[PDB]
Amino acid sequence: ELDFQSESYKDAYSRINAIVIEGEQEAFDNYNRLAEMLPDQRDELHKLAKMEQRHMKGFMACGKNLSVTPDMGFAQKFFERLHENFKAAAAEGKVVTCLLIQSLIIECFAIAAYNIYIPVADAFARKITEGVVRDEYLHRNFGEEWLKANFDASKAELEEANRQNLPLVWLMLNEVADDARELGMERESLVEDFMIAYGEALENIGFTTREIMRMSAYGLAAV
Ligand SMILES: CCCCCCCCCCCCCCCCO
């Protein structure tokens, strides 16, 4: 009983949908830079970027389906600080920090958003998103397997990158709140599903329960 036609919904949608398009666009780029920095896995590293471009096109289609023009300007600025950190990190061969930003933080944020979105999405959008989500399950998380295979060498930079970057996702959660509520996506649910995905991700890489509690609390304990 959400009105996908009303002006509130389309308005909030212009920004939310833009965020996802932009996030996919930057994932595409990011996974290309990662293809350079790790030329060795560039094959698998190139397949993911392409996959996100597909996903990006899908969400664009979700936009026209609702006859909504996505505010791509607002979306660019939503990702800017994290995009800056990724760029700077990338410049300096800091591949661990790049993977944490893209493979862990960005992709946990998206998986959380997609699952909250589905049960309240319109028919077309729900289909695309179910597809996107399936694609994410049925492919290895590259950066996560890498970081895991390389944990001891990467542990310290990860903790640092987590301190530099986790708070920015926290800002993004607060910024996206109003509009997401309009779409029927509860803010509490998003924070919850994010932490669950991120915490599990940090476990898989090699962090202990105590380390995971410490690292997860870095955004919210400042708030
Ligand atoms: C039309 C999609 C609805 C879900 C919107 C989620 C609200 C904000 C989260 C955006 C996260 C974008 C990350 C994409 C990265 C891709 O790998």
Residue numbers in the entry: 9 to 231
The authors write:
Cyanobacterial aldehyde-deformylating oxygenase (cADO), which catalyzes the conversion of Cn fatty aldehyde to its corresponding Cn-1 alk(a/e)ne, is a key enzyme in that pathway. Cyanobacterial aldehyde-deformylating oxygenase (cADO) belongs to the superfamily of ferritin-like di-iron proteins and contains a di-iron center. To gain insights into the reaction catalyzed by cADO, we determined structures of wild type ADO from Synechococcus elongates PCC7942 (Se) with different treatment (WT0, no treatment; WT1, co-crystallized with iron; WT-HP, soaked in H2O2), and solved the structures of two SeADO mutants (Y122F and F86YF87Y). SeADO belongs to the di-iron protein family, with conserved sequence of two EX28-29EX2H motifs, in which six conservative amino acids from four helices (Glu32 from helix H1, Glu115 from helix H4, Glu60 & His63 from helix H2, and Glu144 & His147 from helix H5) act as metal ligands.
Each asymmetric unit of WT0 crystal contains one SeADO molecule, and its active site appears to have lost both of its iron atoms. The WT0 structure is characterized by losing the di-iron cluster and by exhibiting a distorted conformation of helix H5. By contrast, the helix H5 is unwound in the middle in the structures of WT0 and molecule B of other three structures (WT1, F86YF87Y and WT-HP), forming two short helices (H5A and H5B) that are connected by a loop L5. The helix to loop transition results in a different conformation for a number of amino acids (from residue 144 to 150), thus the two iron-coordinating residues (Glu144 and His147) move away from the di-iron site. As a result, most of our SeADO structures with the L5 conformation lose their metal atoms. However, in the WT1 and WT0 structures, the electron density is consistent with a ligand with one single-head-group configuration, which is unlikely to be a fatty acid. We assume that if the loop conformation of helix H5, as revealed in the F86YF87Y structure, was not restored into a helical structure at the appropriate time, the solvent-accessible di-iron center may become unstable. Whereas the instability of the di-iron cluster further promotes the loop conformation, and thus results in a complete loss of the di-iron cluster, as shown in the WT0 structure. The structural flexibility of SeADO provides an explanation for its low iron occupancy, and may be in part responsible for the low enzymatic activity observed for cADO.
